[PDB]
Amino acid sequence: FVVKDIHFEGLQRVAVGAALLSMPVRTGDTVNDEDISNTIRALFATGNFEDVRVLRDGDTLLVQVKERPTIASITFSGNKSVKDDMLKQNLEASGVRVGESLDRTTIADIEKGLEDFYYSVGKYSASVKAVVTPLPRNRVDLKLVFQEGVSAEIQQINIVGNHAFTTDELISHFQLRDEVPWWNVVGDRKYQKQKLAGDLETLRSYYLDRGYARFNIDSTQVSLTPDKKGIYVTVNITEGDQYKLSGVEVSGNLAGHSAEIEQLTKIEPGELYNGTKVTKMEDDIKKLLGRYGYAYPRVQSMPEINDADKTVKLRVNVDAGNRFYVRKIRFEGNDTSKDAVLRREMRQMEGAWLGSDLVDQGKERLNRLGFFETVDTDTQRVPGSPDQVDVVYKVKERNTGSFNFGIGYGTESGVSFQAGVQQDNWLGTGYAVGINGTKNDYQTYAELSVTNPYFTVDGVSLGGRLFYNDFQADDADLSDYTNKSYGTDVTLGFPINEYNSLRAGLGYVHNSLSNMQPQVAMWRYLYSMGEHPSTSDQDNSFKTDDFTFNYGWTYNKLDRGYFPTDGSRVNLTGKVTIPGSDNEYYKVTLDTATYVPIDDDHKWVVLGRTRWGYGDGLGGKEMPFYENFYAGGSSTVRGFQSNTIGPKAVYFPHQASNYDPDYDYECATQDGAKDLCKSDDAVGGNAMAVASLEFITPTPFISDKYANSVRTSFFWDMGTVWDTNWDSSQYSGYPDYSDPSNIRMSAGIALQWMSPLGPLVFSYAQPFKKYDGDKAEQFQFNIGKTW
Amino acid sequence: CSTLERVVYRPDINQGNYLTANDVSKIRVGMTQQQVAYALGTPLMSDPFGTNTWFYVFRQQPGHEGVTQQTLTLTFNSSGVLTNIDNKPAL
Amino acid sequence: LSMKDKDYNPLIGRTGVDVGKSFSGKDWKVTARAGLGYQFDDSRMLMSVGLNAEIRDNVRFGLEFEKSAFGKYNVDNAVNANFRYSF
Amino acid sequence: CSSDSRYKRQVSGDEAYLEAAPLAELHAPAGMILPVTSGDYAIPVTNGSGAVGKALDIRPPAQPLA
Amino acid sequence: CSLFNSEEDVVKMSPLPTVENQFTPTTAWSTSVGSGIGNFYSNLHPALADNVVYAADRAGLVKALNADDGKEIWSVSLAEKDGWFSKEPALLSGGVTVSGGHVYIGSEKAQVYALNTSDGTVAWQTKVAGEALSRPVVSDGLVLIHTSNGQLQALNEADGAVKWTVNLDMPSLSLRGESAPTTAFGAAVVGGDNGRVSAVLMEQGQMIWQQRISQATGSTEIDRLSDVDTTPVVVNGVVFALAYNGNLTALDLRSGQIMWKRELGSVNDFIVDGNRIYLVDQNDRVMALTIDGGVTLWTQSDLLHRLLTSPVLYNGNLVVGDSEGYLHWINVEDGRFVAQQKVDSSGFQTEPVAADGKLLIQAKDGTVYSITR
Amino acid sequence: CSGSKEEVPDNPPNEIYATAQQKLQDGNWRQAITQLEALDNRYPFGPYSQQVQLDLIYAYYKNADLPLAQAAIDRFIRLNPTHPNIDYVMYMRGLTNMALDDSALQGFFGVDRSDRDPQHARAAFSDFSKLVRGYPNSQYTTDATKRLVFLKDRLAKYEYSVAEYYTERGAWVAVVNRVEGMLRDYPDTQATRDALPLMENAYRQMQMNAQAEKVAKIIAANSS
């Protein structure tokens, strides 16, 4: 046959040029039928729609292909609450839409991928169909109809081959639970093969840690009830024999690193065997390889295990991964926060030594930092030489932050307006974006905050912000204290020692304060500053212009978050004032969280919350009385009122208080109180020292995960706070608190449990404030406010 | 400069070249630039205005103003010949 | 007479199938915020108790019911509604 | 809108985006060279005066009549 | 309630129309051990030895009754013997094969032991391996038992006395489907899942032939519905059952080769009454075609998702109660109710009995309510 | 994807496409794309769809319809082994690249952007190289002849930003290789010259002053 006719047929919307490309042999080429079939399945390689009719009558190449509804002008409808957007996006992954002519096997793989999705989920009661009713003239009408069931609602998880270890024990070591009794309501049910695997892993690893080194992984499976849900989880395994970790032996390809590693490898022989030992003992040494710098090693921990002798020798032989290479860090995005801001947020750098460790540090660094929703660390390969590997990483931006309108409860105040505009990730270029405009009726605050914690140096933090609030709520005349409080401050953090930072806050505050009360503390301050308050009216006024500095430092030895286990929160803070400040005085505040369970079972656990505050006025210009910690309330002493302990609110008498508010303000008001009223609950005194004991142990009436999420706290912790700067001439008939004995008696129990969505702290304390300075209440309740 | 009391600069400084006496040993005159390439993996620095003469270094001390400088400049000409070895490992 | 029957051993490498995917999605979440200490002195209550709903990605709105009591000033019922749009 | 944020004829960026600063030659001195044509390099040589910027238009590349 | 009332997937369900009480079913035997069980899935047939209505609970409680109003002879909560914490929760799997003075039981814990029928206390004890799925089969002293995971054991009525273990085939994922391991002419023959049926030696488990028949989940992932349960019926040394999806061959004990087919209905329970058989399928309707070609003269499709138990063609009445506590008699042919008791909400998992025509039922509640109609 | 409800009764492709040209000259590219796609749905046939798709592309970009634009791209180039308009498309496709441009707002001060996505830049580069080589004849031909070098210079500025990051971070060691990488890219971009003093000082820090002076006198005589 002589191909003389470039003869393409059907010609619906085809690139006939691409069709002529599709034939390898062109026309006018006298070729055998072998080349004919070659060309034929080459046209089949178009793989869009190929309705072949190859005819050879004379020399015309009558190769006809007919078009059909094969245009995939589909539609879509008939679906349940299954994620439609995943459906559409995976259709796009297949590209199946208008065009892409059609393919019964492609629509089949779409439908069946959805079906096996159901399967893997176990929702999997497939009522599945991709109805293709083609619209006329080759067009298409599709209906995706899928009535399904629910996922694996966990039925029995029956454990097989178990012994010497109660089933519920390792169950608790696992994830799967199917219980909602009177006991709890949080039990839910679902499926995952991976849950099964990981539970097995926990199981046999645990057994290793019990010294049960040998183990028999038996085929554990799950029968599934037909015609409905039902999940009977055959936990078919066998524990294998108990053994002791007798020895640890190394012969791995290295150079001197053997001794460089043995100190870790070295352990006390004959240990009760532990698989977690094996884990840690290979982890540390891979980390040391990194501390030398290579690719990643083979680590064979061959356990020489002998029965009736419990022996686990560990021929732990490790051959280092390949040598130091360079790499190509490339990250895409590059928005208002340009790449460099992340390039510094990642502890790794090309040119120096490489390592999955450093790139990992970058991973988690961006993770907990965040300007996005992903850390797509993807390493790749440069040819020629096994180095300069392509590590090109992606993030999914979390941009356009908080647009907020807090509207709250007029009808006592004005309806509280709050505009919260926090568009970090937008001017999170390197900066902070904090816009807080709030006002209810008289509590008018504004926060404008911007912080490049990296100003020209990652270490160099730059937080500039104005914090201005005015308290304007009053109820009387010539007694109406009002506070407008502008404060402009810039902060400069400095950790170079990790979890060891000092922060310099340089800030001024203007604070106009009118119609001050006849409080003998504020009046003490007035006469200190020389002011002679009106001994009749609560009327005096002063403008507080204080430029000042504060040093805030913290060390942090922490081991975990959501459930705190080992905590070292070491927090000093000292406010110092310059002669530019209207007063000369220095606050010192010490904050110590010191938390260690001696029990690795976390049942003998010693914890300390300890706090101290002391003001240092230079006389006449002292610690502006309000410049004080809040003793009481629930700061750490609870069932009380904060900044009420110690000093007692003695108001110098003002029966000339100009319309007593009808006892909406008393104690030296017009209709108020006579010669100095020793009302209770004045600001805590100059010196405050409080210490707090804490301990925990799980109760034998719960599950272990609860303990992982619950915190029972025991405490009879007695603080004391007193005004060092004290006079007894006026406090003659009234008590005197320069007194390191302002003790309580709060026989207190508390409980803080955090649901995966919220914590809660509820307490009963039988209180006996030795010095009272507070109200006595037994119900110290609140739910953890996750900041 | 002064004693250990001035503006402190102690985060982690990071530069990596796990160079050892392997380097001292494996090298003679007329070294095979490609074999010594694999022996060294990455050829860091070549003369852009001259032959290869690969230039390596170890300048690393984390934090404090101190740092190393352990250079590996190695002659690499045409015909794949190392005629000379160059290292100033001292500051 | 010729002889070319097998006289060979070829070798190649390929890949048959690779398809793999996973789905994910959320519906909502809620963050409630509450606190109440009794008084427990004359007896009444005093609390600041509210909430916030965390919808899939973008919608966030918070309620707060607060109250101060037993003072010469008393916040009786501070119902406080807010919203957050970090979309 | 009635103020800004439009794009109908102004070419994105500007004509300085159309061209800001032309190239310039350097000369590696004796015995010292530099392999530069390594990557995306198809020698740009135009006689012009092909329309550019506002002169350039991207109107639908249709046919004479339809 | 309209909030946790309109947020779940549903398919369909009948009303079971036209209740016909042509007879008058009187539960002349009315007794209940309560538990029993409430929801689970296993074979847990209670036994009987000449009117002795053996009772029990899903806790190793080995109780009794006799054909009475229900009157116990003994109750022995033989859950465990010296387990982890003194009679651990001993669920049950495998009906009671009371043979001789040996009450015969097995539990998912792979615990098997004879019990003196006079007390239900141990006649012998041989705890086993593998989740004890099936009931004891004390067949001519060859006490043959398979545990769910595709391993079978041969024991003796003496004290267990393992004879030959048959670690047989299993699907990729263990699932439903249990088979009749009955032995005829000295042949350990048994059905099986995976569309497979096995004929082995009842001395070694040595196969004489094994036949693979039809399909199920796996590369054709049939999803969630009543496929064919693999427990057959055999007459004349010829096995009769659907293949695995409703394809009813006949397979001779000596051959097992495919005989006449009935590619119809993924039925699970079935009793043959002289080469008549009956269909219930996947929504629990009845188009009861018999193996006599296509004799559907027994069809009663009034049940839509109305799960049921094995039929009983006793007293000539086509009788079987559903798995929803309701009780149903039927015309000898199709098929309106010669009687019907839409009575309980029990649900049922093991096999009741009509012995002496007495409706020896094991209900989840109202356990043993035997009825006269 | 598949939207743009056909709230209009179906009509011949010619008159509806005439309405499409009406909106084309009218600038309502939303409804224009609406009716164009409505045609190609009601008409997955016809060479009329050729011009329908061309106008689809034009109203995409005049409307900033990016993913729709890519759809037009691949679908048509499947239909296009060659076409009278491909270089147009070629410029358009390079145009497609810059389509990822807009990020902020400036009226008198300005913000920087030439330190961002290189991939689409290189893509447009290839686009216009293939244009000028296959089409050394168009308005797009000359505009691309200059566009190529402009965006290569923009790339130079990008690479400057990249290098200088590590430099200021003291992470010069990588930039030591990076500068010769820029050379394998370009010495002639002004940004290169701009960076050369930086690599010279790096040299000096690391005692390649022996070549820092070289590059310094190179930017002296060679450069300004």
Residue numbers in the entry:
A (entry chain A): 24 to 810
B (entry chain E): 20 to 110
C (entry chain G): 1192 to 1232, 1255 to 1300
D (entry chain C): 25 to 90
E (entry chain B): 20 to 392
F (entry chain D): 20 to 243
Paper excerpt:
The composition of BAM varies by species with only BamA, an OMP itself, being fully conserved across all Gram-negative bacteria. Structures of BAM solved by X-ray crystallography and cryo-electron microscopy (cryoEM) show that BamB-E interact with BamA along its periplasmic POTRA domains and that the complex is overall conformationally dynamic. The full extent of this lateral opening was observed in the structures of fully assembled BAM where the barrel domain of BamA was observed in both inward-open and outward-open states.
CryoEM studies were then performed where we observed a mix of particles with and without MBP-EspP in our 3D sorting, with one 3D class having noticeably larger nanodisc density indicating the presence of the MBP-EspP substrate. The final refined maps had a resolution of 7 Å, revealing not only larger nanodisc density, but the presence of a triangular shaped membrane domain, rather than the oval shape we have observed previously. Guided by the refined BAM structure and the available density remaining, we found we could accommodate at most four strands from EspP. The C-terminal region of the barrel domain of BamA, which includes the conserved loop 6 (L6) and its interaction with the opposite wall, appears to swing out as a rigid body to accommodate the extra density within the barrel. We also observed additional density in this reconstruction extending down from the modeled four EspP strands to underneath the barrel domain, indicating that the pathway by which the MBP-EspP substrate associates with BAM during biogenesis is from under the barrel domain of BamA. While a large globular-like density was observed which loosely resembled a partial MBP domain, we did not model MBP, rather only an elongated poly-alanine polypeptide extending from strand β9 of EspP. In our low resolution structure, we also observe density trailing down from the four integrated EspP strands to the underside of BAM where additional density is observed, indicating that substrate OMPs are likely threaded up through the periplasmic side of BAM to the lateral seam of BamA during biogenesis.
